Symmetry: D2
């Protein structure tokens, strides 16, 4: 009947999401700032499993090591009092004007070195707070113009940065992995490693590829008009889905960061189906923004909404896969045959198989309908709770 | 002054481009069919270096082995008479209704086997005609609905197909490589391996990755709103640019297949800059369609146009890179620093470097302008021939 | 419980939708042709209220007046036997190669005259069959290049065409209205009057604007990334929604023509909400294509699907508006205040109103939250049938 | 040879463009604020004809009437010292949190009244400074969710607002016209009157339509994937192009506000061709942002760039239209026939014209090629300065 989250649902939220003040490129903040401790408490009450942070969300940029220890201890006490976990952390390499041309791939070499020292410092902090995943979103790595960035040199510099972080973590004996987060654009004209695919290909060029995976985001792939569930399947196929960011997006436009379930609802349905079917066991992280039209009550309603919509879709997709009429339709559409090897008999047997070519009745094959529309209307009926 | 192509320019054209009859989803053919021999002759006269083909462009589907030999011999004679080469060939796995749910990843296993036998047969033909690159465009590999295709099983089947083709080629001792051609959509709702990135990541999972690269297409990446020169740089960085398809596209919409230079002209400029700077030496292949508004004279004007616009951009980009004021602006924007290692001194030296963090003047760094707009206006002036 | 359509639901289908053979730009037909009589019969059995046609769907292009009368009489008998109506008809001005540069705005003046005579002929036929709406979709009116079409002269020619059709209809005393159907692109690079807005503005320039409205299509506005329910509201506001075409589209790409409810499901929900709330009483027309993966059984399943998804959304939107908790949330979000005049007191009273400016507490106003997220989660819960 | 602007070129700039501090949704300001007086002086030195402003650019929000008079007098002195004009002004109804749900169409009625009083106040100021055009950009008029805004009530409120402003201006005897500026999205999920078309249709519903036109922006129509030159032609056709905003945009994504000429260079070429050919005589206004990567030197280089690229395109388009080979190609493509009435002979003569139908040789018509590709390559050659 109802859809109450529990910390066993592994729902997590960034400090920066519910704490977004409402500043957009055309307007002033509409909400006062939130204390991180307050967020941890409110989220805990909503059923969340944990929070995530950028270094600058937790410790104001240019804090003395004294202020730093103080900010951390307060945070830690909030975690102890609530049972909230910190499964992921990340570095802000995009807000300060020093990162206007990027962090790891800034043309200025001294900014690149600074970016790495800022990162390493927060990796230590994240390990201490017990994070298992360290996310890297190269929001400023890119260009507005063709001549401003030689992309092969920038990829050299990016690989250099990630290889050095991999060296550091292995030298420290830390138990933490990296997840690269792609985005095609905004705030840069074009961002490097713009999609899950580009990030997966890149990783295979690092010195220790086993240390790195992807942190795809719903809205980000959709800003390229791509099919998010398909891209997630490729990441799963590659064994690289280390984390995931959930939100909603209405097509190709600025990054809207709507609550999860908003935006493309059928894509959310197929995403949940796949995560649950594949046994993804990492956090279900929400990287979203309550619209600036909202007051704090609207903020917590929006965050509750994220979790509620995941649990409703989870139920509907489970119902869909458990439905015997659906299982018969999957066989009718030959999903079972898709899962069988094309040619386990091997190359030579295939070459000698006259039924595969010389004697293949192509006209009869062509006439078989795939029965996909009936299957899809079953999926729709299950999504809408109209099964009868 | 003028811009005449020579076969040394390695400009190539698919039989299907100038031979497109003008059939689109809303309308009948506006042009009669072209004989392949006629195309080879006309293109040779225009300065082209070679042609490419799908098996079905050259031998009508369901031709007897007798008709087949006949079609090939005619073709071959045309090549001998003109000096035209065949550097690339590919398989049509998308036109016949038997491929309505795909070739290599069709749900029906017997269609998948047939698709592989059709492919292998044309690989032999391509080696004979001396092609060095075999292209695979999985135009029908994908779905219109979420339940119709389990994407992890489909990627298993795709890897299976490509691994078997790799086995075949190595067993035959052939000197030919594969290039996968991505496209995000059309004619399927969503196509598997939708961008260069996804194709690069995929290849790294094949049994013999060294046999496979990418054949990116301008219009295709732009249908995802992606930056084509950036994606090409990543392919070059990976050492995987085996071939390239040139055309024009006006943004995110149906695949327009405009002549090269049409569409996004600045992107074409930066693409040519990169190909010539990186020393890409493969064919410059045009995969485009003369608009159906045109008669055959318009067809050859459109094909001449492709080559002419490449040679004009080539000249302008060479002029841009040779310009001492541009070389000074690149230094002003610190492109030289981008090419230098961030930390050749290594991790420990970086960790002990107080100028990289403790003593880094972040406020002075932040105040340095990147001077990118002046550089870009220099690039614009060079493109428009307005340098003074 | 279930969702059975009746002819009172005014669901209509074009002959060309269920009769689409599956030819797309990359592939051959996958289905044999359907006899119009068979379609009328099958659709009648599915609960449809009527059918629509292009002149060329019903009478093969270049039919003798004898064949013509024969085709019509057969059709008519099918309508009599089933009770099916013909509420709308339209002209095919896009398939024949003579229309490759358009019909009403072709550069060649003799093609423009021919286009008008072909149109007028079918208007007579449509009046005879009792249609009340005549649709004009200028699918070929546009350009692939900047110089090919002077758009001001083309708009002159378009207005000329529509004014002449308006003269004809009034001179014949016919009781029929025109609906212009916009589309931003495909099959032309850019099509004239690309959105509902452009078509509405245009109409206001015709000699008898009262004779013309719009026939917006879901997928078409979404190919421009526009909000279809918003555009429909503007048409309703203007009193110009004469007809509507329903289907599904997954974002900005080629025109997918998916069954209604597929594509952007939340947009379909808000569209149905608005049509039913505004009391739109015209046909609910489906302009869609069963995917070419399907056989004829899949064809009729896809058409049934269109009607079923409308009736499910209709129920959910009615439930949403009837819900007292929703009506309280609408008041909380001040939808009631939106409907009240800003200044029924008039200009001078507003100018003398110190509470509107001098004494307006802007800081308190700014702090009121809009409560939109709670309202939207109520809408989501109602859509998913999760209200508790 | 070179391309120096003069105030006779009527190039204008908003205070907010060169004065943009570099704050984007992901980052802090990278540049200090500019004094309006300094901007007027620097722009005057660059050859600009005038500046424009939002009320809040010139007088800080919540300034005492004393501070106000002071800010204005300083501004005025700068204008007197430089000869700079103020042809357009506008209201900021989007930055202050009180406008988070819009100005003219905010759900809260007291915000709507406040929005109108803020507007009226600046209209007086603009008339005083001698502006001839008052621009309205409803940046916050829209919604992120379906239920938050009844679009028919919002259009009622929008018409109410504009009718009241029209009453005010006529009652004051002011010589000023309004230009509505459409944008499809950002910062709202969807914005009302999202394209030029929707704004043109809307105006026709106002009480005094003659007082209102459009202020289209390059990047805005391109964010909908629309053809900007086509939309501008429709506005010209309607006699409603009162002002225009020039900038550059790379496709469908966030509003990039690149300098003019950047983005889609061929579209800029065809836009300049049309403005100059149609005799548009209003300001050429640049609404753009120097990238935040830039220091103040980059700011002025970027602004110089806008004007330079217009003057280069102006020259190339003039050269194109003056070229006798182009004029012959226009005749070959029958642009001359497009400009002739389809049927000046009238309806009855057309109906009795057997050459228009009964005896029209459709097959010969269909075979005529349009010769559009040759024409377009001539346009390309002229744009690139490669004519020989």
């Amino acid at each position: 009947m109802n859809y109450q989250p529990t910390p066993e649902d592994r729902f997590t939220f960034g400090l920066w999401t519910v704490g977004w003040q409402g500043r957009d490129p055309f307007g002033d903040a509409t909400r006062r700032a939130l204390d991180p401790v307050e967020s941890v408490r409110r989220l805990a009450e909503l059923g969340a499993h944990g929070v995530t942070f950028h270094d600058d969300d937790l410790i104001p940029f240019g804090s003395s090591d004294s202020e730093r220890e103080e900010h951390v201890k307060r945070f830690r006490q909030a975690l102890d009092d609530t049972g909230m976990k910190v499964p992921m952390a990340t570095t802000n390499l995009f807000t300060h004007p020093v990162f206007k041309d990027g962090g790891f791939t800034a043309n200025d070499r001294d900014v690149r070195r600074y970016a790495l020292r800022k990162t390493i410092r927060n990796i230590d902090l994240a390990v201490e707070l017990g994070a298992e995943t360290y996310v890297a979103w190269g929001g400023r790595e890119g260009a507005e113009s063709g001549g401003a960035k030689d992309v092969r040199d920038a990829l050299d510099r990016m690989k250099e940065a990630f290889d050095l972080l991999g060296e550091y973590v292995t030298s420290q004996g830390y138990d933490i992995r990296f997840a690269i987060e792609p985005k095609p654009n905004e705030p840069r004209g074009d961002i490097l490693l713009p999609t899950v695919g580009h990030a997966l290909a890149f990783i295979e060029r690092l010195e220790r590829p086993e240390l790195y995976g992807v942190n795809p985001e719903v809205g980000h792939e959709q800003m390229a008009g791509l099919n998010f569930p398909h891209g997630i399947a490729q990441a799963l196929w590659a064994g690289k889905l280390f984390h995931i960011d959930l939100n909603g997006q209405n097509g190709i436009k600025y990054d809207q960061d709507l609550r999860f379930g908003a935006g493309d609802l059928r894509a959310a349905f197929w995403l949940v189906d796949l995560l649950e079917s594949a046994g993804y066991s990492g956090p279900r992280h929400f990287d979203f923004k309550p619209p600036r039209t909202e007051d704090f009550d609207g903020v917590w309603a929006s965050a509750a909404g994220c979790m509620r919509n995941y649990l409703i879709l989870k139920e509907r997709a489970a119902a869909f896969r458990a439905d015997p009429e659906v299982q018969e339709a999957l066989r009718a559409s030959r999903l079972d045959e898709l899962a069988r090897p094309t040619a386990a008999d091997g190359l030579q047997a295939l070459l000698d198989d006259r039924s595969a070519f010389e004697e293949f009745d192509v006209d009869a094959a062509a006439a078989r309908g795939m029965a996909f529309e009936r299957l899809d209307q079953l999926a729709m009926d299950h999504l809408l709770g109209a099964r009868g």
